[PDB]
Amino acid sequence: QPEWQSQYAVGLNKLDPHTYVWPYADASEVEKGTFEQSPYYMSLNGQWKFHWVKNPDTRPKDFYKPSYYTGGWADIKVPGNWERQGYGTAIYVNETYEFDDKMFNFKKNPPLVPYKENEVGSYRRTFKVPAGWEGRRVVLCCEGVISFYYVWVNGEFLGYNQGSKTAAEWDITDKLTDGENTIALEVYRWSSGAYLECQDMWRLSGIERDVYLYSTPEQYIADYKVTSLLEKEHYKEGIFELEVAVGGTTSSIAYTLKDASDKTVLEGSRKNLIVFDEQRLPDVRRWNAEHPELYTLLLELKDAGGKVTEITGTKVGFRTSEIKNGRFCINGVPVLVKGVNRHEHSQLGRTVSKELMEQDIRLMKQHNINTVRNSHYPAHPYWYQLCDRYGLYVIDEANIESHGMGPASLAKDSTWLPAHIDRTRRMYERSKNHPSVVIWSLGNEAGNGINFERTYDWLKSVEKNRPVQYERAEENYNTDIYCRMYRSVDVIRNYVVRKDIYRPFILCEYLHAMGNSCGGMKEYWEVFENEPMAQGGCIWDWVDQSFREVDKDGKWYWTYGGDYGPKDVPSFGNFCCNGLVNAVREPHPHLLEVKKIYQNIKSTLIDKKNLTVRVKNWFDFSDLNEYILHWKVTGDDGTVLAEGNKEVACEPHATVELTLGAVQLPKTIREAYLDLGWTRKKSTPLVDTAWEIAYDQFVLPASGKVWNGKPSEAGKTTFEVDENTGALKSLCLDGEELLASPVTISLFRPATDNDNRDRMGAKLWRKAGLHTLTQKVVSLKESKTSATAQVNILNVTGKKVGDATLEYTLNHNGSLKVQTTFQPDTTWVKSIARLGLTFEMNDTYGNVTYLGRGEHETYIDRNQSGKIGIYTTTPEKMFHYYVIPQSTGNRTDVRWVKLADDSGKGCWIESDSPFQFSALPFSDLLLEKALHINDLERNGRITVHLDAKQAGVGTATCGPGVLPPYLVPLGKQTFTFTIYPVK
Amino acid sequence: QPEWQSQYAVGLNKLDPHTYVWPYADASEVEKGTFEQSPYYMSLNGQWKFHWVKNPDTRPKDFYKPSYYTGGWADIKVPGNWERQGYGTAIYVNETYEFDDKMFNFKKNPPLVPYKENEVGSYRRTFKVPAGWEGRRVVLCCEGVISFYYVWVNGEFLGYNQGSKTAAEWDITDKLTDGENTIALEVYRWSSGAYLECQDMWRLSGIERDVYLYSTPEQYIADYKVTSLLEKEHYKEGIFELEVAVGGTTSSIAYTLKDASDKTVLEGSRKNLIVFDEQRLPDVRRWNAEHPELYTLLLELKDAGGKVTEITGTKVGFRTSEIKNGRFCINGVPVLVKGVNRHEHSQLGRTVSKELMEQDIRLMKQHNINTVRNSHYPAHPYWYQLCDRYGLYVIDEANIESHGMGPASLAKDSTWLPAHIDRTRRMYERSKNHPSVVIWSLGNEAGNGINFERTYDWLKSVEKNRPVQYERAEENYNTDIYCRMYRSVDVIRNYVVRKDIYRPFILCEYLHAMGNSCGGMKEYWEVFENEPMAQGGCIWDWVDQSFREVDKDGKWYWTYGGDYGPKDVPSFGNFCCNGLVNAVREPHPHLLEVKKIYQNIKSTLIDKKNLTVRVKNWFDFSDLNEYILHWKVTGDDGTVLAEGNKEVACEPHATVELTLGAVQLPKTIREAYLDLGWTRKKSTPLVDTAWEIAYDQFVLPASGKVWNGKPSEAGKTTFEVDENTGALKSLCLDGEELLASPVTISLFRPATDNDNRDRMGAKLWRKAGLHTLTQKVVSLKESKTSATAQVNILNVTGKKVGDATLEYTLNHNGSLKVQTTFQPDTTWVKSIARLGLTFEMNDTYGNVTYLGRGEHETYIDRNQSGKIGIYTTTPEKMFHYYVIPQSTGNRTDVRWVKLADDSGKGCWIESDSPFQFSALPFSDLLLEKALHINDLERNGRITVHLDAKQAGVGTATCGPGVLPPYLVPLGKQTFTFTIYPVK
Ligand SMILES: [K+]
Ligand SMILES: [K+]
């Protein structure tokens, strides 16, 4: 019955969507984009009277009349979802509608949403019109509100809106009065629009973005279209065109384009839809992600007497974006799209501050991302100004996702066209003059059909200079870019070798970054970096969508689906957390991998004797003469043998060779590493000149027989093997025990999020009972200084998981060799997570030192990043707080590892080749069992894992699982570890 | 054992307490006091790593070493008590120590606080030294932290501090390094200092005020003493003296005193404790609360080459403060101290923003308060800058209150002298140059003894130009002002008529403003305004100390003692809420009374025929020629008969007569009101020219027989009396019922907070069972159009509370007269709350209109404020949300009241003299029962009360209960109401 139950009720009395035309005070203000400090702007953000009900019948219907008294109401902060200020229920669900549930007495039935279970938040505040605004036109702007609202000013109805992610505006000039004014919005949690707002995110309510007033003369700048292109022959001369829509009602409109040095470079004047003259800048400064060169465009209306009545403006970037000869190109250069999807998220909900937005782009740039896709809705206006300013390509996207709904698709019901086209026009209008926006996207998981054909058609008709994509379009005409998402390496290869294609393969979403993830990233990039027509894609995604809480003991933790509300509250668990960073922008390990693979200066060692390196310049518009190579050779002892700085010139996409020189490795050193690091000669305000923007390490075998790390005999070793399990049950040094538990064979790791979906993952492990192993002795032979045990490896059901031979040999050294031979019964063991030994030490042994890949967590299918070296750390520092606790803390390519107390007591452990290890504060049982961070408890011991083999992590939570070279072999295998007690 | 278990461990390595000597960039910065934007200042506020334990043994001891890893810790906002960010437990107790309780396994035992139950919050963050600070001296400043902390920088111990309300500072210059610095504070909830921090407030923890760094040259301004007095002969020539302490190590120190027009008026130069020359300003601009005239003092160190190396400064106010001929005088004029006590409080705890502080002083000034007492601790530095700027006298007070502890007093244990004198020096040093500070106070509920004798002695030795008071001193020498608090009108009169006294009586705390309160305020002021030597006092207090929460249905409410923690958590209930405003600075009714009695222009009607008024000018330094009188005569119909503006000259403290002129009242009008209102000719930035700063109304009897409000016969009335109760059980108008319940006699009101302590209050009422009354018919006589019932009034125990005669008479009018005669059995009924009728109407009758004192809640002993007039309102608007729900909504001096639906249906009710009424959304049972606002539920009806008599509210929660003229008489009484149905 009411408006928010209709898919047509998308607005009433709003202004036509347009570009932001904030009136500024001063051309100098226009260059800074500093419009909020304008005398013609007034925020309505702040504290507002607020009221909440479940059931629109029980609401205070008359709260919008100035006479209705709201003094006994609470305040609520605006902007900010009300779920994060103590009201109602935050719900996370995924491919479903949270309201399509029994808790709400409703089955989904578009365009209808629940009625009696629907929620109303009534907002009201008062305000004074600034004195200086006398006789001016005043516009009310609400930057975004979810889901549907009525709005009143002074008790006069303005109208209503659906569409939560772009501004709605009303001209409220004739509704204002003297003295105290009031403003009211009545906000519904659900309307028909929610069916198009079924994004993979928190389902939240209320006023999400700024609410404000701005004021213009009776005659104003209503809109304007900026064209700043390059000629398509050499891409060197700028093309400048400008149209200005003047609204209302002798006078002139004039523009001035100025360069970074405030010098005027183009300028026009006319005495309503004014079309200025086409103009040309030769040898113009061009815009792109690496050199975001900008101009400032000032637009002024003038009195019949030549006085300035209004000034507005925007940054201008001369640049082109196109699909050329089937490849996506910026300024005539086909580029690799190294990007990420970004959702808007903070502890306040959908509401993101300027500092958090700046944090976002600062970290992105620091980790070699060059493009961002706006996860299924346009973003806060300020995000685009950041991208123009610091250089990111934006793939902007209409707020349209009806995942919850083939033949019943909302893409094919023409009665939803008005909603679709409204959402699309609004996305286009507000951002059309940003150079940072390179691609328009039509929506997300909303199906294909006539609605997206009209959307595509319309968009193409007004936009000639940006590609338009749509992922659900697949190969149909209505998409300019083949977006297909989460495809496997093979599927990309099936595509690019076809001869009847004309569109680049660019992954809209790929490499699902959920929990301990982003395995197989190297393999994707071997393809992109070699296929002229798979140009990369956008990682899913940037930031975990989580909320930090604190339990009754002061233990903090991350929340996700099911965590707020009653017991059977709709919920898709932790699947909203998929980020390269945690919710407060602290990076996850896998993000360091992304910085490594996304780097723009890649190198190989081409000649070991001269140390000659081939350097490939993956930049699109930067010469390597902007950077400085630092190189150095270092021995396993941590002694720099040769170091230098170097300066190479090399053009984008070109390669270049560089000889470093032979370097004499001593005979006492066992191996050496050649490290290459690159930094910039000039800072940006985001990256200083000490920040390592690309690196590479290469292993140099040397002649030493022993690790300069090997300790010397440190007293008298004893040990004991268990009659029953065959496990090493004791190891002393002059009587002092070193083990807090026996050494046994482990085959299992507490599931990562991926492990839980992986075809070869924890589903198999837990079902074979690998997380519950015991050893039984079949035969045990002992001498004074050695032992050989043949054991059965059983799960808790008693089933034999495999056969093993455990060989303990005390060396004349005092070191103990442990050589293990294991073979799983591959008749019913289809997978193992790892192959190695595990044991506990008392938690005083927290000084961990190792020679291995570091300083951060790496896995065999995620370890291009990091550098082999000597590193100091602790089990507390190694444990990474993934939203659900899972395996963490792995080190790869390990030569040796030490665990010691501060007193110096401990052991130094080596193998016969590079191994993997971890050492964590929490046991495996506990870590597997914990569902939230605060569930973790310490038991006085650390758990050490020594692995000959452990699986990669892959990305199975969505898309490819661990690739085959990274699975753990099931053949008979033998691996050995040698423990050297120390003092 | 550890430092915080000792009362001597008050600091280590701190700088000597001093005045704030922030280095500014610019003399222009110095005038604005804008030091936070200085290049030599850097905030450390923001997000910090945080960790919390119960039990100092279980804490992360090494968190202060740069090597200790805190990446898996949460963040916490600084500043702000941690209890308000999800940690530990907020506790409110009063004259007790929260730790002296069984929950904490501890009995109070100074100087020891609990050990295993004590709480540790470890805070750490990193920071970069600004580049420009190379070679500069750097100071760390923590403006306040509760209770005891250790602090480290870069792993170097700085020292520790006790004393939560003034800054601690360390010179950290040699502890800084290149790159990332770290800072650590380890904060304890309790130390020995807590025994002196037993204020009536929330017991809270952590970093409460700003933490920051400032930077000076090796040679700096360490301190300085400003003297700006007036000659004690005419108080017209300014006396200026300045001492500057220069620390560290050719150079000159120079000052310039400048007036509001940046013109230099005094200035010196010298080539370390520099004493400048005594100087004199004739006809200087003088400082006081009404005209806070200021000068700006700039102090500059200069190079041997005359270059500026450091600039600092402060505002200067030429003014004197003294006890002259036994009276407190500002600038030779004895003033009335109209003030309030202020605690620091927001939703963050003890932490108060600039906007909230400005809100505080803005409302205070708007309600004619001229002085503020700092409730038992010095305040945030910025508070003093507000008082200098806008004009408030400050009574500043050392952070010393050991209420929890006669002969065992901490005032008499000399081992606590170091704590006492430390707390006192610190209060003195930081504020000595503020003109707004007029009185120093020694502490609060801490007893008298040798410690306060040394404190008093010391203070007197360094301070010659401000009185020093101490409330627990009583009449002993160590107090310059007789502060005795909460004394009755009589006790003040016993004092001021003594001839052996030499000290003014100034109430340190009086008129406890808890719940529905501030009764008897007129009577206090009749005394102050007539006793040259009782000069007023400070209301307790300014702001409720409450926290707003939201329950599971979106119902907000205020919290108080017992509301956080387990069940038997220490608690003194709602006694922390005693304010003239609620916690978010919305005023309580009683605050409008304070504006009325504190007003500075008081008037009486001296001649009714000419309308001649006597005007008394209670200002101390303002002529009435700064104001504008608006006057007007108005008839009970709401028709202005005469109005005008007037301009009078009258000197402070002098009186003046003013004839308004005779005015002809029509013969149709029954009474007229003469309203006088005053406004200022010139705005301050706090009070515009439309704000009514003082008013007065006078009643003018006229000849009309009827209220121009009386309706005309509106159809056919019927009614019904109950066979059993004698109650009016029905009243219809053409068949339509008007009552939702019977009309019965009420004697009780849901207890106010005062009612619950009052000698004549709810203790008596509830014990006589007055809240549970029934009527039983003794005899009932009926005719067609009238009824007479003799009833017994019984409590629920069946005991006869009194006898009543109920007389119902239907008038030829259709109006029903109800005449009630009641007499309580004064053998065991010692008190009644009111005498009147009560009944319910369905809640559609929400349109209330009345001719009475309004627009706000008044009681017979709190009704000097407001104006009789015609007012529109609703039961929802009438209900005031006192922290615990209690009686509210009373109107006094009522001629008639109407209750109608929007359709216009209802009744118009009059009496035979002024009565009282209320009409509320919640029943009395429910209102009495509710302990928190969200407990209140609506039942579909409003409760109307028509009172012939109701008690005052008094101030018994602390101090005098309802005064005798305001008690409800227990004699036989007869009162009548006439109900006129309307359509
Ligand atoms: K887990
Ligand atoms: K109550």
Coordinates of N, CA, C and O in Angstrom, one line a residue, chain A residues 815-906:
Chain A
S815 N 73.5 -33.5 19.8 CA 72.3 -33.2 19.0 C 71.5 -34.5 18.7 O 72.2 -35.6 18.7
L816 N 70.2 -34.5 18.6 CA 69.4 -35.7 18.4 C 68.8 -35.6 17.0 O 68.1 -34.7 16.6
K817 N 69.0 -36.7 16.2 CA 68.5 -36.7 14.8 C 67.2 -37.4 14.9 O 67.1 -38.5 15.6
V818 N 66.2 -36.9 14.2 CA 64.9 -37.6 14.2 C 64.5 -37.8 12.7 O 64.3 -36.8 12.0
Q819 N 64.5 -39.0 12.3 CA 64.2 -39.3 10.9 C 63.0 -40.1 10.9 O 62.9 -41.1 11.6
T820 N 62.0 -39.7 10.1 CA 60.7 -40.1 10.1 C 60.3 -40.6 8.7 O 60.5 -39.8 7.7
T821 N 59.7 -41.8 8.6 CA 59.2 -42.3 7.4 C 57.8 -42.6 7.6 O 57.4 -43.3 8.5
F822 N 57.0 -42.0 6.7 CA 55.5 -42.1 6.8 C 54.9 -42.4 5.5 O 55.4 -41.9 4.5
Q823 N 53.9 -43.1 5.4 CA 53.1 -43.4 4.3 C 51.6 -43.6 4.7 O 51.3 -44.4 5.5
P824 N 50.8 -42.7 4.2 CA 49.4 -42.8 4.5 C 48.7 -43.8 3.7 O 49.1 -44.0 2.5
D825 N 47.7 -44.5 4.2 CA 46.9 -45.5 3.5 C 46.0 -44.8 2.5 O 44.9 -44.5 2.8
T826 N 46.5 -44.6 1.3 CA 45.7 -43.9 0.2 C 44.5 -44.8 -0.3 O 44.2 -44.8 -1.5
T827 N 43.9 -45.5 0.6 CA 42.7 -46.2 0.1 C 41.5 -45.4 0.7 O 40.4 -45.5 0.2
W828 N 41.8 -44.6 1.7 CA 40.8 -43.8 2.3 C 41.3 -42.5 3.0 O 40.6 -41.9 3.7
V829 N 42.6 -42.3 2.8 CA 43.2 -41.0 3.1 C 43.4 -40.3 1.8 O 44.3 -40.7 1.0
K830 N 42.6 -39.3 1.5 CA 42.7 -38.6 0.3 C 43.5 -37.3 0.3 O 43.8 -36.7 -0.7
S831 N 43.8 -36.8 1.5 CA 44.4 -35.5 1.7 C 45.1 -35.4 3.0 O 44.6 -36.0 4.0
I832 N 46.2 -34.7 3.1 CA 46.8 -34.3 4.4 C 47.2 -32.8 4.3 O 47.5 -32.3 3.2
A833 N 47.2 -32.1 5.4 CA 47.4 -30.7 5.4 C 48.8 -30.4 5.5 O 49.3 -29.4 5.1
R834 N 49.5 -31.4 6.0 CA 51.0 -31.3 6.2 C 51.6 -32.6 6.6 O 51.0 -33.6 6.9
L835 N 53.0 -32.5 6.6 CA 53.8 -33.7 7.0 C 54.9 -33.2 7.9 O 55.8 -32.5 7.4
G836 N 54.9 -33.5 9.1 CA 55.9 -32.9 10.0 C 55.7 -33.4 11.4 O 54.9 -34.3 11.6
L837 N 56.5 -32.9 12.3 CA 56.5 -33.2 13.7 C 55.8 -32.0 14.5 O 56.0 -30.9 14.1
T838 N 55.2 -32.3 15.6 CA 54.7 -31.3 16.4 C 54.9 -31.6 17.9 O 55.0 -32.7 18.2
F839 N 55.1 -30.5 18.7 CA 55.3 -30.7 20.1 C 55.2 -29.4 20.8 O 55.3 -28.3 20.2
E840 N 55.0 -29.4 22.1 CA 54.9 -28.2 22.9 C 56.1 -28.0 23.8 O 56.7 -28.9 24.3
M841 N 56.5 -26.7 23.9 CA 57.4 -26.2 24.9 C 56.7 -25.2 25.8 O 55.8 -24.5 25.4
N842 N 57.1 -25.3 27.1 CA 56.7 -24.3 28.1 C 56.9 -22.9 27.5 O 57.8 -22.6 26.7
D843 N 56.0 -22.0 27.8 CA 55.9 -20.7 27.1 C 57.0 -19.7 27.5 O 57.1 -18.6 26.9
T844 N 57.9 -20.1 28.3 CA 59.1 -19.3 28.5 C 60.1 -19.3 27.3 O 60.9 -18.4 27.2
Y845 N 60.0 -20.3 26.4 CA 60.8 -20.4 25.3 C 60.4 -19.5 24.2 O 60.3 -20.0 23.0
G846 N 60.1 -18.2 24.4 CA 59.4 -17.4 23.5 C 60.3 -16.6 22.5 O 59.9 -15.9 21.6
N847 N 61.7 -16.8 22.7 CA 62.6 -16.1 21.8 C 62.8 -17.0 20.6 O 63.5 -18.1 20.7
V848 N 62.2 -16.7 19.5 CA 62.3 -17.5 18.3 C 63.2 -16.7 17.4 O 63.1 -15.5 17.3
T849 N 64.2 -17.4 16.9 CA 65.2 -16.9 15.8 C 65.2 -17.9 14.7 O 65.3 -19.1 14.9
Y850 N 65.3 -17.4 13.4 CA 65.3 -18.3 12.3 C 66.0 -17.7 11.1 O 66.1 -16.5 10.9
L851 N 66.5 -18.6 10.2 CA 67.0 -18.2 8.9 C 66.0 -18.7 7.9 O 65.8 -19.9 7.8
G852 N 65.2 -17.8 7.2 CA 64.1 -18.3 6.5 C 63.4 -17.1 5.8 O 64.0 -16.0 5.9
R853 N 62.4 -17.3 5.0 CA 61.6 -16.3 4.4 C 60.8 -15.5 5.5 O 60.2 -16.1 6.3
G854 N 61.0 -14.1 5.5 CA 60.3 -13.3 6.6 C 60.3 -11.9 6.2 O 60.6 -11.6 5.0
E855 N 59.9 -10.9 7.1 CA 59.5 -11.2 8.4 C 58.1 -11.8 8.6 O 57.7 -12.2 9.7
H856 N 57.3 -11.9 7.5 CA 55.9 -12.3 7.7 C 55.4 -13.7 7.2 O 56.1 -14.3 6.4
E857 N 54.3 -14.1 7.7 CA 53.6 -15.3 7.3 C 53.6 -15.6 5.8 O 53.0 -14.7 5.1
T858 N 54.1 -16.7 5.3 CA 54.1 -17.1 3.9 C 53.7 -18.6 3.8 O 53.9 -19.3 4.8
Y859 N 53.1 -19.0 2.7 CA 52.8 -20.4 2.4 C 53.3 -20.7 1.0 O 53.6 -19.8 0.2
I860 N 53.5 -22.0 0.7 CA 54.2 -22.4 -0.5 C 53.5 -21.8 -1.8 O 54.2 -21.6 -2.7
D861 N 52.2 -21.5 -1.7 CA 51.5 -20.9 -2.9 C 51.3 -19.4 -2.6 O 50.4 -18.8 -3.3
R862 N 52.0 -18.9 -1.6 CA 51.9 -17.4 -1.3 C 53.2 -17.1 -0.6 O 53.2 -16.8 0.5
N863 N 54.3 -17.1 -1.4 CA 55.6 -16.8 -0.8 C 56.6 -16.2 -1.8 O 57.8 -16.3 -1.5
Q864 N 56.1 -15.5 -2.8 CA 57.0 -14.6 -3.6 C 57.5 -13.4 -2.8 O 58.4 -12.8 -3.2
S865 N 56.8 -13.1 -1.7 CA 57.1 -11.9 -0.9 C 58.0 -12.2 0.2 O 58.3 -13.4 0.5
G866 N 58.5 -11.2 0.9 CA 59.5 -11.6 2.0 C 60.9 -11.8 1.4 O 61.1 -11.7 0.2
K867 N 61.8 -12.0 2.3 CA 63.2 -12.2 2.0 C 63.8 -13.2 3.0 O 63.5 -13.1 4.2
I868 N 64.5 -14.2 2.4 CA 65.3 -15.0 3.3 C 66.3 -14.2 4.1 O 67.0 -13.4 3.5
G869 N 66.4 -14.4 5.4 CA 67.4 -13.7 6.3 C 67.3 -14.2 7.7 O 66.5 -15.1 8.0
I870 N 68.0 -13.6 8.6 CA 68.0 -14.0 10.0 C 67.0 -13.0 10.7 O 67.1 -11.8 10.6
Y871 N 66.0 -13.6 11.3 CA 64.9 -12.8 11.9 C 64.7 -13.2 13.4 O 64.7 -14.3 13.8
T872 N 64.4 -12.1 14.2 CA 64.0 -12.4 15.6 C 62.5 -12.0 15.8 O 62.0 -11.1 15.2
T873 N 61.8 -12.9 16.6 CA 60.4 -12.7 16.8 C 59.9 -13.6 17.9 O 60.7 -14.2 18.6
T874 N 58.6 -13.6 18.2 CA 58.1 -14.3 19.3 C 56.8 -15.0 18.9 O 56.2 -14.6 17.9
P875 N 56.4 -16.1 19.6 CA 55.1 -16.7 19.2 C 54.0 -15.8 19.3 O 53.0 -15.9 18.5
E876 N 54.0 -14.8 20.2 CA 52.9 -13.9 20.3 C 52.8 -13.0 19.1 O 51.7 -12.7 18.6
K877 N 54.0 -12.7 18.6 CA 54.0 -11.8 17.4 C 53.7 -12.5 16.1 O 53.3 -11.9 15.2
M878 N 53.9 -13.8 16.1 CA 53.7 -14.6 14.9 C 52.2 -14.9 14.7 O 51.8 -15.0 13.5
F879 N 51.4 -15.0 15.7 CA 50.0 -15.3 15.6 C 49.3 -14.1 15.0 O 49.3 -13.0 15.7
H880 N 48.6 -14.3 13.9 CA 47.9 -13.2 13.2 C 46.4 -13.4 13.6 O 45.8 -14.5 13.5
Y881 N 45.8 -12.2 14.0 CA 44.3 -12.3 14.4 C 43.3 -12.2 13.2 O 42.7 -11.1 13.0
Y882 N 43.2 -13.3 12.5 CA 42.2 -13.4 11.4 C 40.9 -13.4 12.2 O 40.9 -13.9 13.4
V883 N 39.9 -13.0 11.5 CA 38.6 -12.9 12.2 C 38.1 -14.1 12.9 O 37.8 -14.1 14.1
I884 N 38.1 -15.3 12.2 CA 37.9 -16.5 12.9 C 39.3 -17.1 13.0 O 40.1 -17.0 12.1
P885 N 39.7 -17.5 14.2 CA 41.0 -18.0 14.4 C 41.3 -19.3 13.5 O 40.4 -20.2 13.5
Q886 N 42.4 -19.3 12.8 CA 42.7 -20.4 11.9 C 44.2 -20.5 11.9 O 44.9 -19.8 12.7
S887 N 44.7 -21.4 11.1 CA 46.1 -21.5 11.0 C 46.7 -20.2 10.6 O 46.2 -19.4 9.9
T888 N 47.9 -19.9 11.2 CA 48.6 -18.7 11.0 C 50.1 -18.9 11.4 O 50.3 -19.9 12.1
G889 N 51.0 -18.0 11.0 CA 52.3 -18.0 11.6 C 53.3 -18.8 10.9 O 54.5 -19.0 11.3
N890 N 52.9 -19.4 9.7 CA 53.9 -20.2 9.0 C 55.1 -19.4 8.5 O 54.9 -18.3 7.9
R891 N 56.3 -20.0 8.6 CA 57.4 -19.5 7.8 C 57.8 -20.5 6.8 O 57.8 -21.7 7.1
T892 N 58.2 -20.1 5.6 CA 58.6 -21.0 4.5 C 60.1 -20.8 4.2 O 60.7 -19.8 4.6
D893 N 60.6 -21.7 3.4 CA 62.0 -21.7 2.9 C 63.0 -21.6 4.1 O 63.9 -20.8 4.1
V894 N 62.7 -22.4 5.2 CA 63.5 -22.2 6.4 C 64.7 -23.0 6.4 O 64.7 -24.3 6.2
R895 N 65.9 -22.4 6.7 CA 67.1 -23.3 6.9 C 67.3 -23.8 8.3 O 67.6 -25.0 8.4
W896 N 67.0 -22.9 9.2 CA 67.1 -23.4 10.7 C 66.3 -22.5 11.5 O 66.0 -21.3 11.2
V897 N 65.8 -23.0 12.7 CA 65.1 -22.2 13.7 C 65.5 -22.5 15.1 O 65.8 -23.7 15.4
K898 N 65.5 -21.5 15.9 CA 65.9 -21.6 17.3 C 64.8 -21.1 18.3 O 64.1 -20.1 18.0
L899 N 64.5 -21.9 19.3 CA 63.6 -21.4 20.4 C 64.3 -21.4 21.7 O 64.8 -22.5 22.2
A900 N 64.3 -20.3 22.4 CA 65.1 -20.1 23.6 C 64.4 -19.3 24.6 O 63.5 -18.5 24.3
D901 N 64.7 -19.5 25.9 CA 64.2 -18.6 26.9 C 65.2 -17.4 27.0 O 66.1 -17.3 26.2
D902 N 64.9 -16.4 27.8 CA 65.8 -15.2 27.9 C 67.1 -15.6 28.5 O 68.2 -15.0 28.2
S903 N 67.1 -16.6 29.3 CA 68.3 -17.1 29.9 C 69.3 -17.7 28.8 O 70.5 -17.8 29.0
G904 N 68.8 -18.1 27.6 CA 69.6 -18.5 26.5 C 69.4 -20.0 26.3 O 69.8 -20.5 25.2
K905 N 68.8 -20.7 27.2 CA 68.4 -22.1 27.1 C 67.4 -22.4 26.0 O 66.5 -21.5 25.8
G906 N 67.5 -23.5 25.3 CA 66.6 -23.8 24.2 C 67.1 -24.9 23.2 O 67.7 -25.9 23.7

